[PDB]
Design an enzyme around this catalytic site. Sequence first.
Site, PDB file in Angstrom:
ATOM      1  NE  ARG A  93      77.081  37.138  85.147  1.00  0.00           N
ATOM      2  CZ  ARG A  93      76.780  38.199  84.400  1.00  0.00           C
ATOM      3  NH1 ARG A  93      76.922  39.429  84.871  1.00  0.00           N
ATOM      4  NH2 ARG A  93      76.332  38.024  83.162  1.00  0.00           N
ATOM      5  CG  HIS A 137      76.786  44.340  86.399  1.00  0.00           C
ATOM      6  ND1 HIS A 137      76.431  43.054  86.044  1.00  0.00           N
ATOM      7  CD2 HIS A 137      76.009  45.162  85.648  1.00  0.00           C
ATOM      8  CE1 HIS A 137      75.464  43.097  85.143  1.00  0.00           C
ATOM      9  NE2 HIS A 137      75.201  44.366  84.873  1.00  0.00           N
ATOM     10  CD  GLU A 183      76.322  43.631  78.898  1.00  0.00           C
ATOM     11  OE1 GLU A 183      75.829  44.782  78.899  1.00  0.00           O
ATOM     12  OE2 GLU A 183      75.659  42.587  78.732  1.00  0.00           O
ATOM     13  CG  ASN A 320      76.714  39.090  79.149  1.00  0.00           C
ATOM     14  OD1 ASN A 320      76.982  37.953  79.546  1.00  0.00           O
ATOM     15  ND2 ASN A 320      76.935  40.168  79.889  1.00  0.00           N
ATOM     16  CE1 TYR A 322      71.627  40.192  77.750  1.00  0.00           C
ATOM     17  CE2 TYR A 322      69.317  39.727  78.296  1.00  0.00           C
ATOM     18  CZ  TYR A 322      70.618  39.944  78.694  1.00  0.00           C
ATOM     19  OH  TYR A 322      70.910  39.925  80.033  1.00  0.00           O
ATOM     20  CD  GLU A 393      74.023  39.603  81.388  1.00  0.00           C
ATOM     21  OE1 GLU A 393      73.305  40.272  80.590  1.00  0.00           O
ATOM     22  OE2 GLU A 393      74.760  40.114  82.246  1.00  0.00           O
TER      23      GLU A 393
END
Length: 482
Positions: A93, A137, A183, A320, A322, A393
């Site tokens: 990506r 982005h 995002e 995404n 984390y 992600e």
Amino acid sequence: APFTYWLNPEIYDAGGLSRRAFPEGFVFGTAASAYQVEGMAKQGGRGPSIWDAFIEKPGTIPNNATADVTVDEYHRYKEDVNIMKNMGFDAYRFSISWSRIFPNGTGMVNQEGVDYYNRLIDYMVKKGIKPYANLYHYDLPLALHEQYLGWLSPNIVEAFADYADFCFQTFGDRVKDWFTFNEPRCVAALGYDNGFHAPGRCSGCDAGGNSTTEPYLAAHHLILSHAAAVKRYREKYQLYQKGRIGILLDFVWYEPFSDSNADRAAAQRARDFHLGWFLDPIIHGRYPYSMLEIVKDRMPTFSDEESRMVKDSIDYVGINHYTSFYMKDPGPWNLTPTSYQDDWHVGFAYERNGVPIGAQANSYWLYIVPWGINKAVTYVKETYGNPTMILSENGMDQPGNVSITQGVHDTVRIRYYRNYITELKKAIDDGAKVIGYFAWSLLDNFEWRLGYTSRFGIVYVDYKTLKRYPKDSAFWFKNMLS
Ligand SMILES: OC[C@@H]1[C@@H](O)[C@H](O)[C@H](O)c2nccn21
């Protein structure tokens, strides 16, 4: 130093993970972005973006570093794609820089920019790496910000849709998987709530702004821009190109600090303001109830027509993910609006009963909490009608100041990936419709406000020479995926 080449036995402990442990056709990939890896920021016909202007202010990036060159994927893309292929990845990506295609956002196409993306994509296809193209982005063309303050104007919606349309027409014969935005929560909150990211607006910020209203305005136009681009794809291209389009949303897992009604409500409210802000419009055609009731008049409304365009404007959602935090009720609320972040009315916690929720990575925000990915994916499954998801992600960082020799022995990153992917597999075995997983990122790169002080890569980059050195984590993937 010779220790660079010590063979870490952690590489071969896949913890029972393999492709057979995932659904048939499951995609493993890496993710990056145009500004963070390309270089040639002021060359090749590329017009300035809001980050080019933002970085100019002294003190913004540590050591006044820039992304004018960064890891130079612009010239080194064959090497990077070769590593991706050699480590066993199925997909990459990347993002397309709007201002590399349209230097001023509209009108004149920069052919040299088009030719770059055509080279990158053709090589990927040659090497059997699937292209997943993100259109945005953080890199808004500066001209659009100068003209009408970018995301704060309804003018941006059709500007974005035209840019998207061009990309579909030009690249869609080989790109079959699209994302409109990376995002938009970050774009809105960091760009316009606290000014931590370009264009650096907030209440009392040097660039100006208003934290009570501008985040919500930007988010609204991002949602409209997403839906207008998806309209272009669906009406003009999708039937012929036979591809898919979605959006990439960050989702931190918010866990109730206790089982009290107040703490559970706090956690839900954080989910609403973080993820529901974008996902509720896309899945239900309306904003979250808590947001509507708290933010009131400061949140824009969708017309009936807009709501129809926005609802079901995805073929899949990229999550995404984390990290995770505990969430508390913060007590009685202040009645005076000050910021989007303050509108959540929640208390953050990072430990419980003297035990941290997890160890911290290099980044201030990043706590290592593997069980969080399971809860987050299960939450999206249960809340949004079991949508098709990509885990788009996942990763962690080391300090930038580490040498090649120690930088490549990233046992902590191996553990991160082994544990998080294991927890993701549990969610998938329990019914979650996840069709892919992407690690952030292949290469150490320009980490926005942290510049080069943060290393997220599974491949170490010596910034002095631009040479790549696969870390033990890359070899871990290589072994796990084979
Ligand atoms: O912080 C590491 C990376 C960023 O480099 C990039 O913007 C990515 O989209 C992202 N989302 C959450 C974290 N990250």
